[PDB]
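Task: complex structure prediction.
Instruction: return structure tokens for all chains below.
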Amino acid sequence: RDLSRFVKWPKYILLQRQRRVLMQRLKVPPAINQFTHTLDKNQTSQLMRLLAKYKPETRAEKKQRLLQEAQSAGGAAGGKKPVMIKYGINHVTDLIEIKKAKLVVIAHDVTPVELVCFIPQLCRKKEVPYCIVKGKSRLGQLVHQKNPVLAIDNVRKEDQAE
Amino acid sequence: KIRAYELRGKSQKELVKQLEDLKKELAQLRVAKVTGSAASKLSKVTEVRKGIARVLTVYTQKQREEARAAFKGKKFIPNDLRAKKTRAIRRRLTASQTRKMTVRKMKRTQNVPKRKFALIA
Amino acid sequence: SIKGLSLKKHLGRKQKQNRPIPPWIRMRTGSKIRYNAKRRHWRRTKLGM
Amino acid sequence: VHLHKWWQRYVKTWFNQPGRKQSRRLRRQEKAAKLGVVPSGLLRPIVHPPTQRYNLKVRAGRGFTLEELKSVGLSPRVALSIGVAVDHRRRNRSAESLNANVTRLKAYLAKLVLFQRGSKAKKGLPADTPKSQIQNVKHVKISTAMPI
Amino acid sequence: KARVRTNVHFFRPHTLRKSRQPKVVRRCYEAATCTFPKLAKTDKYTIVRQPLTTESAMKKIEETNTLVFLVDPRSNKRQIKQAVKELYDVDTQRVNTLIRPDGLKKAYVRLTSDYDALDVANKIGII
Amino acid sequence: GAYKYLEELWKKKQSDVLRFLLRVRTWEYRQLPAVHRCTQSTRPDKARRLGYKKKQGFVIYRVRVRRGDRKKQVHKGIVYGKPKNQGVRKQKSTRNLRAVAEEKVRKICGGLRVLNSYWVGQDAVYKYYEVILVDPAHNAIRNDPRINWLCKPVMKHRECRGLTSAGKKYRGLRTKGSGAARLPSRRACWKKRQAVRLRRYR
RNA sequence: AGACCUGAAAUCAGGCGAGGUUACCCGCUGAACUUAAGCAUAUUAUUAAGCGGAGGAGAAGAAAAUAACUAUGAUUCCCUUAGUAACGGCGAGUGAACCGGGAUCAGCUCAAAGUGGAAAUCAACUGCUCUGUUGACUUGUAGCCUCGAG
RNA sequence: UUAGCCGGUCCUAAGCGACAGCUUAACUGCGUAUACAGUACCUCGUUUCGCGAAAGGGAAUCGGGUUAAUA
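Output:
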């Protein structure tokens, strides 16, 4: 038979299951519990089509970008001011305070959860809108990292009604 | 009669043959010690066993010269040759690393140079 | 007797240190040596090895 | 008498005393071989001691003051190259203690010849002295040059 | 969602284990174009030190076809058989072996019925 | 900046947000072994401040030390000596448990060199620290100038000699002035006054 | 199916630790003989023995300092304060520090902000005399800043 | 002072060292806890390594001769 209920597991499997039990059982605080309240997968598909337009460049693209500037017009006027996603918490907290960020989009999963407890209030006090999205890994794919909090300070003209 | 400068001529085939030749003569001396002899014979053992030790030295000397010729100016040199010194001396950082400064402390060193000054009589 | 090879060699060595000193050694220059100091009789004084 | 402890362990004797004198004295000389032209220590200010029984006296201080160097117009940055102590803690509460040390600094910078780094002369960073160049004596020691 | 597992026990998975392959060689005997290879520690000569000659040993050589030698005490009974074959060019029936009080192996070596010992003892000069 | 917000709400320990979150963590730690590795910092706020830098060759271990005091180590509490010394139970030890933790992490990590430590939580029977370590053999630490000072041979086992932050507190170099006049070192100062100074002209 | 997160395995590739020495040095641990003409607090002693860790020196170190003056100005060491202030069955005994005069002199850098017109950073492996290919890294690496201001 | 057959060597007893960990500043003390066949494809899988008997367990040898001293 399948006895996959009754298996004496290793300690590491038993720990990463008894965490998920223990965080259901205990009374969670309202601030920590904020990230149980999340977008629908149809609501999240509406972001990931949008945010893929404003994708910051790969590290290999910096070479090819710079070969063009290495001077076809003249200095930094070889292009316009390039618009993209801003990322990494310690930039994006500054970018909320000085009041540039249009939307500020966040992971529920973030593992030391202290990192992101304060951010939903910051956004609400300044009147910046924010979301919560299922998966810090999904937000990582846009940025070209492994894994919290992404923001749009600036847009194109074409995509600004959306 | 062997001298070590003469063996630095001879080949890696030849050295082996000579080494073998001596060991025969060393063996046939041990037989004569056992059976019957005089002290005229038993001094010749001292010459030949120093002869053997020369031929091992010279062989091993050529073995290491070809290795050091080959691995010269290359990383991952074999452990057999690799500059002993002390344990503590081997550890540490290169003069370049100890010597090297930050971009900050470069600027404070550079812009305030060591001035030759004197006091008047 | 039923000894190990290690103990056989320790015994072995201390036979070979139990012989009179060579005659020619005293003859040589600047030597105060007279009869071996460490000689042992198998009854009188014992090894434990 | 305080000899109830095992005091024989910690008896310090002074048989080295002359050997210590002559070892200090060898490294003062071997310092001044390397310097030669350059004088040894560095210049220190005039300073009243603190509490009321040494209040009359004057002694040498640690180093000058960021206020005092601003009057003459050294940087606190550069002053250790010329051989002036900076002390960033010591204030000037009085006008009198200020104008003593400013006189002492200005008199020192009158003494100070400063060689070119080579080849060409270069103003500032007192000045570049040209190859006119009046004869400097060797290391004077700086305390003995400009005493209290 | 998960694999259907039958045993109640969790066992450790099997993984690839690479053999060593240590990049660059330790000692310089074993390299490409070394051409001075290592000379051997145990030759035929350092096994078989010397023959014995005594009243006890010479009695055997006549009658029982048997040569006595003093050999290195670390040596093996199969090495002595092959070292005696290399030196004197004679095939061995039966080696016996014995560590004297000294710390020296004495090897009694009976030769095969094909050969004779008094031919070989005169060739060496144990006579 | 985000690290300012982290230190400000880490100050509020008694709050329901942090007291929940610290009750869950202290559970996790007492399932795992006594000295074991974390793969990244629990408090990145706090470690950054103690000169942690997330590049290669920095690492970080947890450690757990039992709370409370130790008995004097005698058979059946039978002391032998003058009634002052008949004191088994209420002893204290000189050195804080933060420093003990740094010490435990000499044998387990002999090669690694300890930088600093910080509190990550506590329990009635345990008390948990994250100890910042370094590999001095690694070239990322060895090349760069700002933690090349740790690769010198003087900075071996500086946990054992009492030269961390927490080691330096129990020695009492953290105070200075008239209070600390007594203790270069407690022993070094003691040797200086005790010596009979016999100058050669008397 | 694919992104992470966590935990294992390997005689994987390349590294680092262990043990020894005792004069001096750093940290723990910790007595009694003895003195008090007894003795228990006290003393011997924050010593011996015990258990750790170093180096050519070690530790200490640029004030959360002394002071109450016309103020001084990292640390160490010497002389002096001083057998003083103070501790103590206020018994026996114990006992520093500041100022002063000397040796010697040397200052500094991280966290707390600000590349955000664009991780500028670091390691490993390979390639000519400083390119390429993987990884680390935005849960923060360079540059800037350290209160003497910035 | 000569061994396939005489013993050790191999097995486990009372017990004893270490693994996982657990204590303690360490020294020590405890220690059965654990993820430990049919290049490629399956299907099984509960015991952890070792030490500890020349009187316990255990593959196989007997006659006669021989040396100053071994069988």
